[PDB]
Write an enzyme that holds these catalytic residues in place. Sequence first.
Site, short mmCIF file in Angstrom:
data_model
loop_
_atom_site.label_atom_id
_atom_site.label_comp_id
_atom_site.label_asym_id
_atom_site.label_seq_id
_atom_site.Cartn_x
_atom_site.Cartn_y
_atom_site.Cartn_z
N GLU A 83 -0.91 -8.68 3.27
CA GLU A 83 -0.37 -9.93 3.84
C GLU A 83 -1.30 -11.12 3.60
OE1 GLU A 83 2.65 -9.97 4.41
OE2 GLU A 83 3.32 -8.18 5.51
N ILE A 124 0.87 -1.18 0.00
CA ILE A 124 0.00 0.00 0.00
C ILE A 124 0.91 1.23 0.00
CG2 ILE A 124 -1.67 1.38 1.30
CD1 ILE A 124 -2.90 -1.26 2.31
N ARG A 159 -0.69 -12.35 0.16
CA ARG A 159 0.57 -13.11 0.04
C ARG A 159 0.51 -14.52 0.64
NH1 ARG A 159 3.49 -7.86 2.41
NH2 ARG A 159 4.00 -6.71 0.50
#
Length: 244
Positions: A158, A71, A161
């Site tokens: 996250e 971000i 990912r």
Amino acid sequence: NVRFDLSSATSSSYKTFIKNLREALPKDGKVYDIPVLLSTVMDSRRFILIDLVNYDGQSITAAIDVLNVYIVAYSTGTVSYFFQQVPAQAPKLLFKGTQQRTLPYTGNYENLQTAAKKLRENIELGLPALDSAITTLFHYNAEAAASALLVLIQTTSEAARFRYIELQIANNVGTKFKPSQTIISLENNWSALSKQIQIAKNKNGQFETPVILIDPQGNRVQITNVTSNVVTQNIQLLLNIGAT
Ligand SMILES: *[C@@H]1O[C@H](CO)[C@@H](O[C@@H]2O[C@H](CO)[C@@H](O[C@@H]3O[C@H](CO[C@H]4O[C@H](CO)[C@@H](O)[C@H](O)[C@@H]4O)[C@@H](O)[C@H](O[C@H]4O[C@H](CO)[C@@H](O)[C@H](O)[C@@H]4O)[C@@H]3O[C@@H]3OC[C@@H](O)[C@H](O)[C@H]3O)[C@H](O)[C@H]2NC(C)=O)[C@H](O)[C@H]1NC(C)=O
């Protein structure tokens, strides 16, 4: 924009949002069946926008750098806020027409934790925590924003990912939790895992250098090859080797 709203939030709708976030990122193929991000990209395709809407129907839009899932900035629709040290072209390309401000820190965890005056493990996650974070950022207050940004980053970047992180949050639709050292270990080692998995492709699946993680029971574990659970059924995006 890919959008997540709390009014209709369920475990399934959150998983769908994270799937759509992952899909919106351009890829450079797959390594061991895991999509790899691009090394470079033209400015006109450098950022994706995601909308996050709280229970009261108030929306913020976060801008994500497609090369690393970071971000870089967010907007309330009228005012936007950029981290320090983001890609130089971000202000020119994003949220044109808003009043553009700079946040007093970078987006890395060390700097965000300093600004929040607390650790990631001290800050609640879960969808009710996302609601509160959206509200805090929509009604920007300088003292409270770093903690809210830590919630936002872990709930978007996250989770995209790591399947493990996505599922922990999906399991907390109406409840809150503080992230375990398992979660923290994955976040801290995303770049290292990305590097080693790409190296392993030319070494019969063997890492050049081990990666040390914390398993769900809190045990130190050493990852040395692509047969490990973290590689086969957890990590969902690799940082390009060029950036590791
Ligand atoms: C690529 O990588 C993999 C590694 O993922 C290579 O294989 C794996 O290697 C690991 C690490 O050595 C190994 O795990 C350990 O297993 C030990 C033996 O466990 C068996 O026997 C004991 C009794 O002796 C039983 O209690 C068990 O239930 C099991 O039957 C085990 O003792 C180790 O634990 C020790 O360390 C942990 C901390 O990490 C402590 O909690 C323990 O108290 C012990 O001190 C260890 O066990 C793992 O512990 C962490 C947990 O998260 C894991 O779930 C648990 O497995 C794996 O057994 C081994 N896996 C396989 C399939 O062989 C692999 O060869 C290599 N592949 C290549 C090169 O192709």
